[PDB]
Design a protein around this motif. Structure first.
Motif, mmCIF file in Angstrom:
data_model
loop_
_atom_site.group_PDB
_atom_site.id
_atom_site.type_symbol
_atom_site.label_atom_id
_atom_site.label_comp_id
_atom_site.label_asym_id
_atom_site.label_seq_id
_atom_site.Cartn_x
_atom_site.Cartn_y
_atom_site.Cartn_z
ATOM 1 N N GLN A 269 -19.954 18.218 96.202
ATOM 2 C CA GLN A 269 -19.780 16.965 95.466
ATOM 3 C C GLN A 269 -18.868 16.002 96.215
ATOM 4 O OE1 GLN A 269 -21.485 15.831 92.945
ATOM 5 N NE2 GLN A 269 -22.630 17.725 93.265
ATOM 6 N N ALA A 270 -17.735 16.470 96.740
ATOM 7 C CA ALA A 270 -16.851 15.553 97.463
ATOM 8 C C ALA A 270 -17.601 14.910 98.623
ATOM 9 C CB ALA A 270 -15.584 16.254 97.950
ATOM 10 N N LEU A 271 -18.382 15.702 99.338
ATOM 11 C CA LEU A 271 -19.093 15.168 100.465
ATOM 12 C C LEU A 271 -20.174 14.175 100.028
ATOM 13 C CD1 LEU A 271 -19.602 15.129 103.541
ATOM 14 C CD2 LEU A 271 -21.217 16.970 103.155
ATOM 15 N N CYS A 272 -20.948 14.501 98.995
ATOM 16 C CA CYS A 272 -21.942 13.565 98.454
ATOM 17 C C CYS A 272 -21.299 12.253 98.004
ATOM 18 C CB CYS A 272 -22.689 14.181 97.270
ATOM 19 S SG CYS A 272 -23.803 15.510 97.766
ATOM 20 N N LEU A 293 -14.611 15.105 106.956
ATOM 21 C CA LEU A 293 -15.075 16.167 106.064
ATOM 22 C C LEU A 293 -16.216 16.964 106.681
ATOM 23 C CD1 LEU A 293 -14.945 17.825 103.507
ATOM 24 C CD2 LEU A 293 -15.961 15.918 102.281
ATOM 25 N N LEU A 294 -17.124 16.294 107.368
ATOM 26 C CA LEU A 294 -18.206 17.008 108.040
ATOM 27 C C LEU A 294 -17.640 18.030 109.019
ATOM 28 C CD1 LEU A 294 -20.742 14.090 108.686
ATOM 29 C CD2 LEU A 294 -20.958 15.997 107.048
ATOM 30 N N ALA A 298 -17.526 22.264 108.868
ATOM 31 C CA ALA A 298 -18.108 23.100 109.917
ATOM 32 C C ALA A 298 -17.094 24.152 110.340
ATOM 33 C CB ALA A 298 -18.598 22.278 111.122
ATOM 34 N N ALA A 299 -15.820 23.770 110.399
ATOM 35 C CA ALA A 299 -14.727 24.677 110.788
ATOM 36 C C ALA A 299 -14.565 25.885 109.862
ATOM 37 C CB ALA A 299 -13.410 23.911 110.873
ATOM 38 N N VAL A 300 -14.867 25.732 108.571
ATOM 39 C CA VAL A 300 -14.884 26.881 107.683
ATOM 40 C C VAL A 300 -16.314 27.352 107.445
ATOM 41 C CG1 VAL A 300 -12.650 26.436 106.626
ATOM 42 C CG2 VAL A 300 -14.740 25.376 105.642
ATOM 43 N N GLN A 301 -17.215 27.004 108.364
ATOM 44 C CA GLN A 301 -18.600 27.463 108.350
ATOM 45 C C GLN A 301 -19.397 27.212 107.086
ATOM 46 O OE1 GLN A 301 -15.987 29.481 109.706
ATOM 47 N NE2 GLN A 301 -16.986 31.051 110.935
#
Ligand SMILES: [Cl-]
Length: 426
Positions: A269-272, A293-294, A298-301
């Motif tokens: 949701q935060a990303l959307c 955020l992207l 990715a860093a936490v897969q």
């Protein structure tokens, strides 16, 4: 003179006559007047301001009131008292409901008139309580903008101490409910300017009381990361985030992505919601947030989130390229998405059908900034067609549209495509 002014404003005399008569009414203030005379004029002029049928009537009300209040300040102080002001805020005035912008405007105007009077101190104290109540009630943008003008002029009306934080949090929640149901373009420009005023107030509060900043930004994060199905936060929240220091964005993104209590759904949701901030007409630096955020994800897969949200949103991001102010940011987001989404042509093929029309629309517009933008877009498109080769019919119209732009070397394309991919099937 109040009976004369009254008669005049309801008359059909020619405008220059109305004006000469109003001038004489205005000059009448500069005489000794008893309390009943002063109160009668203050009643009438207030009625004309708040209920004046046309701009002229309201303007006359303002002129006469200013003159009478200036020359009879103690009588205006008695008239514009705590009970009257509270009454306006809770019951409105005649046909006007309490939420009418004209009411808050009249109060602001009145504060200017009594600001040299002893009663002003208790008005400020009263207003600190009322304005916190007002923002808790989720006011519409136009009223909230007027409130912002008032509080900018009179900072003594802003709730203080611990309540200053509460006020900022509630104002963030309030901004999150802003919408504009009108589709007329004039209304929409007004909406944006209203929201800008409210945002400016809040940024000014952050400067003056730094302890309000973090809690305010935390509230923004709670809004955008909400998984409450019945509520969609407004993209007006984007107006707040344009001038946040980089370090602060890092703290927030890090907490959102690494806090073991945050659910995957909340991150999605935060990303959307952050990507939707690109929709905000003044979304110049939204890309800084979205890309942080992207990368944070990715860093936490969280690759499935990245992949699913990209498929959901990439068309929206591409379409933002039509809006010149947000275009560099939308391109940065699009580029990160496309170059990271390396396991399937699906995301790129969602944007393919929109490429020719965009290119055709900008390549002969006479703007060197459009040409430089297209050099970057066509480079990105060439990389994607190389990476996702074997669709010659799909790509032919695009290759035709972009034939006059630089084509990167195969060697350069392969290096570009060495970008970290999002791991599919994770
Ligand atoms: Cl091909």
């Amino acid at each position: 003179m109040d009976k004369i002014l009254e008669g005049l404003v309801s008359s059909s005399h020619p405008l220059p006559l109305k004006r000469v008569i109003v001038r004489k009414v205005v000059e009448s203030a500069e005489h000794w007047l008893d309390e009943a005379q002063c109160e009668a004029m203050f009643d009438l002029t207030t009625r004309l301001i708040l209920e004046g049928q046309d701009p002229f009537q309201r303007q006359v009300g303002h002129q006469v009131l200013e003159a009478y209040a200036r020359y009879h300040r103690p009588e205006f102080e008695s008239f514009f008292n705590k009970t009257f002001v509270l009454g306006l805020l809770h019951q409105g005035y005649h046909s006007l409901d309490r939420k009418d912008v004209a009411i808050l405007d009249y109060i602001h105007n009145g504060l200017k008139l009594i600001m040299s009077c002893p009663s002003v101190l208790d008005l400020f104290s009263l207003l600190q309580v009322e304005v916190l109540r007002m923002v808790c009630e989720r006011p519409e943008p136009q009223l909230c903008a007027r409130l912002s003008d008032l509080l900018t002029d009179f900072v003594q009306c802003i709730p203080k101490g611990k309540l200053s934080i509460t006020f900022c949090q509630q104002l963030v929640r309030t901004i999150g409910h802003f919408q504009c149901v009108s589709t007329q373009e004039r209304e929409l420009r007004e909406y944006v300017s209203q929201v800008t005023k409210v945002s400016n107030l809040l940024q000014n509060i952050w400067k003056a009381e730094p302890a309000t900043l973090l809690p305010s930004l935390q509230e923004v994060f709670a809004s955008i990361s909400s998984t409450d199905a019945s509520f969609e936060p407004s993209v007006a929240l984007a107006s707040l985030v344009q001038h946040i220091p980089l370090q602060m964005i890092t703290v927030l993104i890090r907490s959102l992505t690494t806090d073991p209590n945050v659910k995957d759904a909340s991150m999605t949701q935060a990303l959307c919601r952050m990507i939707d901030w690109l929709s905000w007409p003044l979304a110049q630096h939204v890309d800084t947030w979205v890309i942080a955020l992207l990368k944070g994800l990715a860093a936490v897969q969280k690759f499935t989130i990245l992949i699913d949200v990209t498929l959901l949103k990439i068309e929206l991001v591409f379409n933002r390229l039509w809006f010149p102010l947000v275009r560099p940011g939308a391109l940065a987001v699009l580029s990160h998405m496309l170059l990271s989404f390396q396991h399937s042509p699906e995301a790129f093929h969602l944007i393919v059908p929109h490429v020719v029309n965009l290119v055709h629309s900008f390549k002969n517009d006479g703007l060197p900034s459009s040409t430089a933008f297209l050099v970057q877009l066509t480079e990105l498109i060439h990389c994607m067609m190389y990476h996702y080769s074997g669709f010659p019919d799909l790509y032919e119209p695009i290759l035709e549209a972009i034939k006059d732009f630089p084509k990167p070397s195969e060697e350069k394309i392969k290096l570009i495509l060495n970008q970290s991919a999002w791991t599919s099937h994770h």
